[PDB]
Design an enzyme around this catalytic site. Sequence first.
Site, PDB file in Angstrom:
ATOM      1  N   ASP B 324       0.814  -1.225   0.000  1.00  0.00           N
ATOM      2  CA  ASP B 324       0.000   0.000   0.000  1.00  0.00           C
ATOM      3  C   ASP B 324       0.851   1.280   0.000  1.00  0.00           C
ATOM      4  O   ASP B 324       0.357   2.375   0.290  1.00  0.00           O
ATOM      5  CB  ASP B 324      -0.926   0.019   1.222  1.00  0.00           C
ATOM      6  N   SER B 349       2.101   6.778   1.221  1.00  0.00           N
ATOM      7  CA  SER B 349       1.191   5.918   1.960  1.00  0.00           C
ATOM      8  C   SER B 349      -0.190   6.057   1.320  1.00  0.00           C
ATOM      9  O   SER B 349      -0.811   7.121   1.401  1.00  0.00           O
ATOM     10  CB  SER B 349       1.136   6.331   3.430  1.00  0.00           C
ATOM     11  N   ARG B 350      -0.674   4.998   0.680  1.00  0.00           N
ATOM     12  CA  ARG B 350      -1.954   5.094  -0.029  1.00  0.00           C
ATOM     13  C   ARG B 350      -3.190   5.058   0.874  1.00  0.00           C
ATOM     14  O   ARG B 350      -4.303   5.358   0.431  1.00  0.00           O
ATOM     15  CB  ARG B 350      -2.040   4.092  -1.184  1.00  0.00           C
ATOM     16  N   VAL B 351      -2.974   4.715   2.144  1.00  0.00           N
ATOM     17  CA  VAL B 351      -3.972   4.923   3.191  1.00  0.00           C
ATOM     18  C   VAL B 351      -3.976   6.407   3.591  1.00  0.00           C
ATOM     19  O   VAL B 351      -5.033   7.025   3.714  1.00  0.00           O
ATOM     20  CB  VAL B 351      -3.701   4.037   4.435  1.00  0.00           C
TER      21      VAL B 351
END
Lengths: 473, 487, 469, 43
Positions: B324, B349-351
């Site tokens: 992610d 950080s794709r969150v």
Amino acid sequence: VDLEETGRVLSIGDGIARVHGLRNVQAEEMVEFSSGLKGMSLNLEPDNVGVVVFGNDKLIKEGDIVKRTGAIVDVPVGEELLGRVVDALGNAIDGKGPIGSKARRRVGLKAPGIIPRISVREPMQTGIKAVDSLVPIGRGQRELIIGDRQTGKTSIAIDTIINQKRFNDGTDEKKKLYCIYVAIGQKRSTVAQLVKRLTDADAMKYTIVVSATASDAAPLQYLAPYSGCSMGEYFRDNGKHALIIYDDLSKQAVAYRQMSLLLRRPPGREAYPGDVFYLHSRLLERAAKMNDAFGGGSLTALPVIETQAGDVSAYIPTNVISITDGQIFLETELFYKGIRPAINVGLSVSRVGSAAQTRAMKQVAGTMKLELAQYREVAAFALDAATQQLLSRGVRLTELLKQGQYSPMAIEEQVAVIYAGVRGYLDKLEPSKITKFENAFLSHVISQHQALLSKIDAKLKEIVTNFLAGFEA
Amino acid sequence: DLEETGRVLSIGDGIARVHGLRNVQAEEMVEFSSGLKGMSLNLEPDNVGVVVFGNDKLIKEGDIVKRTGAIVDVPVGEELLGRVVDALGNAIDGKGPIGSKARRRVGLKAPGIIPRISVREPMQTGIKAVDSLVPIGRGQRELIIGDRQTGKTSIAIDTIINQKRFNDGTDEKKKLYCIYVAIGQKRSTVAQLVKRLTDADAMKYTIVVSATASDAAPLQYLAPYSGCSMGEYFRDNGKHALIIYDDLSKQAVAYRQMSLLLRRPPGREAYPGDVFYLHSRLLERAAKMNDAFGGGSLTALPVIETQAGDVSAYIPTNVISITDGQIFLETELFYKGIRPAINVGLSVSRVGSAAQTRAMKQVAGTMKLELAQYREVAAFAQFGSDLDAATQQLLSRGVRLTELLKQGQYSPMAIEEQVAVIYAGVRGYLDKLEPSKITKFENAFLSHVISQHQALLSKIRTDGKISEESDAKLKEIVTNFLAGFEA
Amino acid sequence: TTGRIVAVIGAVVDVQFDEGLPPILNALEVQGRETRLVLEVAQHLGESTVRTIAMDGTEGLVRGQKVLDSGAPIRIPVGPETLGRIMNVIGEPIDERGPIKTKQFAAIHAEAPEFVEMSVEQEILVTGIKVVDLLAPYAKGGKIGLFGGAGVGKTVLIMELINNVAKAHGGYSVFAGVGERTREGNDLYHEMIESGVINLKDATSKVALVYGQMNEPPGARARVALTGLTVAEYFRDQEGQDVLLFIDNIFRFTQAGSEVSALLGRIPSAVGYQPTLATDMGTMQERITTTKKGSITSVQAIYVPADDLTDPAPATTFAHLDATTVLSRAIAELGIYPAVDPLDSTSRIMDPNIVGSEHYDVARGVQKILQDYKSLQDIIAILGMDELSEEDKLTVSRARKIQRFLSQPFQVAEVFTGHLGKLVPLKETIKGFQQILAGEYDHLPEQAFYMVGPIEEAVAKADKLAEEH
Amino acid sequence: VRSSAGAVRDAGGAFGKREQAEEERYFRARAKEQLAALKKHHE
Ligand SMILES: Nc1ncnc2c1ncn2[C@@H]1O[C@H](COP(=O)(O)OP(=O)(O)OP(=O)(O)O)[C@@H](O)[C@H]1O
Ligand SMILES: Nc1ncnc2c1ncn2[C@@H]1O[C@H](COP(=O)(O)OP(=O)(O)OP(=O)(O)O)[C@@H](O)[C@H]1O
Ligand SMILES: Nc1ncnc2c1ncn2[C@@H]1O[C@H](COP(=O)(O)OP(=O)(O)O)[C@@H](O)[C@H]1O
Ligand SMILES: [Mg+2]
Ligand SMILES: [Mg+2]
Ligand SMILES: [Mg+2]
């Protein structure tokens, strides 16, 4: 058929006979085919021997009888090979009759260990100014000559062989140097031009030419360097000195690759056998300087490697660079710019040098090495303001390391010309003239000032400037 | 009994070909005559190809091999905490047997779509650059990537150490158990790592699973999955675990060895085709579980070593595509004085925001913007005079915020402390200060607020946000501290 | 028990045994040979046949020729009697001085010390080499690697370390010549006799030599490192003194295994290497180590083929080391020796809690200036020097003085140059770089800092040059 | 995006070789000035 001593061909294709029988045959033994051909047993397998054929394998047929000779592959050695051209198995190919050698040597004998050796002590003089001053070679050393096609590699080797005459005609036995040129994969007309060059220079009389040319079977080209090496080792071990040239090891690796693939040994990096490093490392380790208890003799090697488009990082080039004591790097750019011999002085390296390269050479080349290293740091400037006093000396010195072909020079002759540049006597002469200057200057010194070339710096210092001044008119 | 037993036909390079074992399963544990364990990976018509979980040099033609009846598994549970084990979960610390109640198959399927819920809890590293700019949430997979010696392991270790603050406390929701998987490292390195964790008193909530450089390839291949199964025990029982795979580059090399020697078809860089699948099944097991499935989580920090920074190489390509996001580290940044050597531009950080407290989300949001603006003008600082004051403002802010991202080793920070120093930078209380003095200021300012403003730091923690009353309070503290700074 | 050769292909020999099959790693003795020929069992092929690798040439071998199983792996002389002697892969003397009369022998194959036997002690080992001691210092009982392409100076560096470290060492040293030049074995041997390090007239020699050079077939080259480390292992475990282990060159252990891998029946891995490159290195490297029983300081020269540090061989080596000295061709071509890369050499002890904050701060300040210098060189390539700001010119001036003060005349290099070797104490090294960075020598030309020892020789060199001006 | 300081020197390209010569030119002119200043400080 006696299956212990003889066999019959099961299959034959592309230089490889699979042979039934020969139960008592040794690895690396020479065998003989009924047709007259010789071969070497390389692959001993449960149901067959993979025989590699030393010649026209197309003459062999299924069913043909193959016989043991009982002997690991060997070659004739001795002074009888001097002045002769031979194939990879030591047979005469110069039409001058049989070799009368009373001695033979296995081709794959171990290199001398730690004990039989001693520190390299004597100069191997090439008569090439750039080498003898800046990349000096010692006896027992391995110095690689490496570069692209047509950069001048063979030319260095030949000038070096030619230079030895001044020693070999001399009365000092310890300075004599016997030469071996191994031609691998070359065309026959090129080798013929070579021996003609050597003969015209009166250099064949102390040279053995071993030739495994382009239409000789792959095993013969594989074997050639080892045969030549054995012939040099006879000098090494009998108190004499030999120089061997392997021209070139790129073509030997190719032949080794063919042979190995057709024996069905799996292809490694670039399809080369897994042990191509070893092929070259074991060969070059045989060049050595011997201690006095072993005769004081020596064998020096100049292997030759062809790069492709300047790629020294390539597989085979990197192997041999990592083996040798030093290397002479030749470059196309330099060649065409007028730098001939096309040596890259910055990259070219030789191992120290015995204290003895010479002593008067150590003087003048000592200052030239310093002066060119400082130059190389600024060379790239090639408008300019005061960066031109930084360029002056170096540019002149670069012109003085240029040298024509087939005229190798005495050490005193090299010193005399380097001196003129190094003592700044050409600093105002047009850098394009220096080539004309050197030849004319050197001719005049040779002819009329032979006494000056003597004992090779108080009287000599004053006398050189006497000529140089008046000459530079 | 050729159904339950077999005999060794041949053995070399750690592969045993076995006649018999007719009833053996694919991926079953088998046992050799010496005591060594193996795994049945190739079921062929006339032989089983067995990879050896130990010294395969001890096996000989003719040796008896027996079934265990079980798919390869490992011990799992709280008895592993504080322990250093090998890939099979045997103790190697000399502290006795693992008092294990439960075992777990190493190769269990990841949770599916339904059991999960989006990552929304902070997994705090205590590292300012990460928690503000590359934030990680519980259940996330975040790659740590870079060439040798850029600080990769140090990120993971400082993260582990940071969890003490939570693990010592009374809030069970913030607790995080840690697993460190060492793969292909030398034993003295792992011992130094364990010394560090012990000294920090972080070993009490950590499991170290180690398959070192002299351990047979199948053990190095196995170790991440074993550690993974340990973490999943916590995930499924309403708890939270963090797992570090140090590193996956070495695990793929070990897998490639086994695969090539099993004569499985080779592919790019001689890795087998299923090398993607090796890493995908491992990392998809890190997950955030919804409340209906216990609420637990497993967070993964795989480590990849790049060569000359080539992220287009086969194995780094695979792992980047799986995870992610990545924290990217660089040697150039390291020697410039950017330590930790995080390339913020290349890190993601794709969150993102969802994994941050509101307090951080406040200040980080603006810092991200101003560094991104500064990174476009950064070259103009080193050579640019007659430039407008607007770009001069971006450069002054940027060089100063950059100094706030620097951090020494082994000193993870409480979230409130990070946001206090970041607040100072983003509100402009450093703008008139020399860049060389920013770290001195940060240290001094932090000492001051910790010593005499705990009440402000506590509330920001508890509430997880900066209220208007908190912001007015913090506004005055920085102003008064800065006013009497250089004594 | 007796087997019979059934196949010979280069270094690879298959042997069939009627009754007892020799375990993998067992040494087998070929009968009917003039000199001893050992085959080491590598594989059980099935049908009572093992595949082996030869420890010497296979010329002259015949199918049906007899082979005795020795009952054990290769076993060599260990203990005080190896001191002052030169031995083979298989433990035979090669110094022509007679039998090695040891009481004790040891298998060259052995298990690596367990995790519980690890030592965590970390103490600086001062070499007197400025670059090393400053930027990537060695630790006593640590693992040290010297990386470099061809001809950059690995061997010169390792010999200087034998001159600096081993000649001040109170315990025992071991040197393994692995796949390098025989002539260098001769150099090393006679050098050590000259310096009394080997004493031929009594029992006082403090170094054991093991050689298997590039003239040798790949079996011997693949196993010689094990022979040398075995000698070191005995000293570590059975005696009470610290051990030094020097190896030139460990790449050649990995190369040697690649040379036979295809003939052993493996599919090649990447860059033509054996699939077992990493584990083979691991099982060997993990034995070269300090334990709770005793300390080995290991220094390994590591060839980097074609200067490519990402090549699988040196790339896989990095994980096995506590300190790395990375040599660089670009730096050697500038005339800086030793040609150490200050921004690519590392040490686990480069930590302010270990070397102290002063040492650490000066090291990181030096690296910062050299790193900043790299960015400036790109700009200079377009703009030129005169156009830079006074601040940047100062960064360039100082970084250049630093680069040159990192060079140093080696005692062992007194042959190339004629200049006397220099040994610089640690505190002197720290002071000099501290002073350069602080700007204390902004008034001297950079040439004064080239090839000197301590900072006072630079001040004095500047004085000689002023007179010659 | 990706760090790349020193890439010009690293290439051994014309621009690389030129920059090396340009630095050398500058610092040899500096050395001349500094050695004279050191001569006149000598007395
Ligand atoms: N010092 C020199 N001065 C002028 N010309 C030279 C010199 N050395 C070599 N040459 C010329 O350059 C050409 C190539 O030289 P040479 O045959 O030695 O190169 P090579 O690298 O061995 O090439 P190849 O083996 O691929 O044919 C020849 O025509 C030769 O006459
Ligand atoms: N934030 C930091 N500040 C200062 N030094 C640091 C920091 N992080 C790491 N280091 C130092 O950097 C060095 C390398 O760090 P680390 O071993 O974590 O890197 P790595 O990428 O894991 O390298 P390896 O290739 O050895 O696995 C160590 O000496 C470590 O102490
Ligand atoms: N410290 C040094 N001082 C001076 N010259 C050196 C030094 N190190 C290497 N050299 C030069 O490089 C050559 C090769 O060094 P060596 O150590 O043999 O290289 P390798 O890395 O191939 O072992 C030496 O003969 C010498 O010319
Ligand atoms: Mg030619
Ligand atoms: Mg690490
Ligand atoms: Mg060397």
